[PDB]
Write a protein that binds this ligand. Structure first.
Ligand SMILES: *[C@@H]1O[C@H](CO[C@@H]2O[C@@H](C)[C@@H](O)[C@@H](O)[C@@H]2O)[C@@H](O[C@@H]2O[C@H](CO)[C@@H](O[C@@H]3O[C@H](CO[C@@H]4O[C@H](CO)[C@@H](O)[C@H](O)[C@@H]4O[C@@H]4O[C@H](CO)[C@@H](O[C@@H]5O[C@H](CO)[C@H](O)[C@H](O)[C@H]5O)[C@H](O)[C@H]4NC(C)=O)[C@@H](O)[C@H](O[C@@H]4O[C@H](CO)[C@@H](O)[C@H](O)[C@@H]4O[C@@H]4O[C@H](CO)[C@@H](O)[C@H](O)[C@H]4NC(C)=O)[C@@H]3O)[C@H](O)[C@H]2NC(C)=O)[C@H](O)[C@H]1NC(C)=O
Ligand SMILES: *[C@@H]1O[C@H](CO[C@@H]2O[C@@H](C)[C@@H](O)[C@@H](O)[C@@H]2O)[C@@H](O[C@@H]2O[C@H](CO)[C@@H](O[C@@H]3O[C@H](CO[C@H]4O[C@H](CO)[C@@H](O)[C@H](O)[C@@H]4O[C@@H]4O[C@H](CO)[C@@H](O[C@@H]5O[C@H](CO)[C@H](O)[C@H](O)[C@H]5O)[C@H](O)[C@H]4NC(C)=O)[C@@H](O)[C@H](O[C@@H]4O[C@H](CO)[C@@H](O)[C@H](O)[C@@H]4O[C@@H]4O[C@H](CO)[C@@H](O)[C@H](O)[C@H]4NC(C)=O)[C@@H]3O)[C@H](O)[C@H]2NC(C)=O)[C@H](O)[C@H]1NC(C)=O
Lengths: 208, 207
């Protein structure tokens, strides 16, 4: 079979919040017992970097090894579209495998953020749905959360971003809670994090 | 050797007796040595005699693409009959078999609401009209817009999104000229789904 390489980006929230630590993760699977050594080289815009942290290989339940290398990235490097390449060498390969990742090309556009009460018809159910519209953003990378009185909610589903005709993206998030609370008048908050926002963050609330 | 992928028919094609719903068997990476590809189709075991094979197709990456298309009875697909593509090639280790069928479970009727342009867009050249469609099952659905019978096309629709009760929702966004909205033109969001009466419903709005 021969090894395979997957290269994963940082989470958008981690590149947008200076307090978080964004990482790019290069994962090698199907490493054989006969040729277990795996070498990583990393490059940032084709210049070799030497600060990645590579973990000991780990035997999987199918008897092949998985080996992961992690490169921490500067938030502003990632946001300035630098390109991260992982090159993986292994004696079982005819040649080194390379993977490159970077954020989405294109000019950024600031999302417009709106919230919406439950469909008035829903106003007798066990539960109600709260909506958050996010539209006109570019690039597609974004995080959307819900909180109440500074507490992370979690019963929400968010559509993927949808490419709009204008080249910008939109999506909706739908938080579902107890009928009680919305009348009770608790205040719910939709949080959006995106590179084209001021402080990369904005939040819209609503209640009864 | 080559890969097999087997694709369902389109939701709309199953819901309107005037349309011709098809399952579609695609083979990639067919070389020239054994360009020889055979298909057998079966519905719920019983073999049937009507699939059609396309004129085949080359990618400049050095290989072919060979498609067999079988037309289905609408009611059969909707009742969940299984559809099997059996693919034979003098270049495969063994012949490959794929089954597909409609998502299982009790159909649930969508709820459709249209919503007017936001807030601040009225200063713009253009406005967005919205259609929310929620609570449906299975996820096979078609959503379309029109104005005075005329179909629009300047609209985009999120994919179905799985909700926590195991039903689905989506939104569709139609972009129009501020001028067309303001003259009180009527816009309609149309939804086709097996759990609706006549598989069809339409919701309207205007200034
Ligand atoms: C040489 O090149 C070949 C061709 O490349 C292209 O060719 C042209 C165009 C050229 O310009 C090139 O630039 C192009 O790259 C290579 O062929 C490609 O092979 C790969 C596999 O290696 C294919 O990938 C698969 O894609 C399907 C999705 O289906 C397609 O969508 C893509 C993207 O849109 C598209 O490319 C194809 O067109 C397919 O589109 C659909 O086709 C159907 C077929 O008819 C259309 O439906 C029909 O439409 C009609 C009218 O349109 C009627 O209505 C009819 O009724 C209807 O049926 C439909 O319009 C169209 N849809 C869309 C959206 O476009 C993947 O799903 C598929 O499975 C995957 O499997 C992976 C593992 O193998 C997995 O990791 C993935 O997640 C995925 O799914 C998983 O896998 C399991 C097993 O498969 C599943 O069981 C399971 O669900 C799931 N896993 C889990 C855990 O859930 C696969 O990835 C690729 O599409 C090929 N491209 C083309 C154009 O055919 C070739 O490889 C290469 N060779 C070499 C040697 O280098
Ligand atoms: C033997 O075992 C190993 C290991 O498996 C385990 O053990 C076995 C015994 C069994 O028990 C398993 O159940 C166990 O899991 C098997 O290894 C597996 O190998 C397959 C390939 O054969 C890989 O499949 C790929 O998967 C990726 C998706 O990645 C993730 O998501 C899954 C869950 O869905 C996870 O299980 C994975 O771990 C991985 O999870 C992500 O991991 C990253 C890295 O850590 C995390 O990111 C970091 O997170 C940090 C915090 O945690 C921080 O945020 C960091 O900054 C961040 O970097 C993620 O958070 C985490 N995500 C999740 C949800 O957990 C999938 O993308 C691959 O996708 C495809 O590529 C294939 C080619 O195979 C194409 O067919 C498809 O198109 C598809 O995508 C396209 O691919 C092309 C390139 O080919 C790409 O360029 C295009 O962009 C794509 N196209 C499009 C249109 O988009 C592929 O499916 C498994 O990932 C791997 N598992 C593990 C655990 O590594 C091995 O296969 C077995 N061997 C044998 C012989 O059987």
């Amino acid at each position: 079979g021969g090894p395979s390489v997957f290269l994963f980006p940082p989470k958008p929230k981690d590149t947008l919040m200076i307090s978080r630590t964004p990482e790019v993760t290069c994962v090698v699977v199907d490493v054989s017992h006969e040729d277990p050594e795996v070498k990583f080289n990393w490059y940032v815009d084709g210049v070799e970097v030497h600060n990645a942290k590579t973990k000991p290989r780990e035997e999987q339940y199918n008897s092949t090894y998985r080996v992961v290398s992690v490169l921490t990235v500067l938030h502003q490097d990632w946001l300035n579209g630098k390109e991260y390449k992982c090159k993986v060498s292994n004696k079982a390969l005819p040649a080194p495998i390379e993977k490159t990742i970077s954020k989405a090309k294109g000019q950024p556009r600031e999302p417009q953020v709106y919230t919406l009460p439950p469909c008035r018809d829903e106003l007798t159910k066990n539960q109600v749905s709260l909506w958050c519209l996010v539209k006109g953003f570019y690039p597609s990378d974004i995080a959307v959360e819900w909180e109440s009185n500074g507490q992370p909610e979690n019963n929400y589903k968010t559509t993927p971003p949808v490419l709009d005709s204008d080249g910008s993206f939109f999506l909706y998030s739908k938080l579902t809670v107890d009928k009680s609370r919305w009348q009770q008048g608790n205040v719910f908050s939709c949080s959006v994090m995106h590179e084209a926002l001021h402080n990369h963050y904005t939040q819209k609330s609503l209640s009864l």
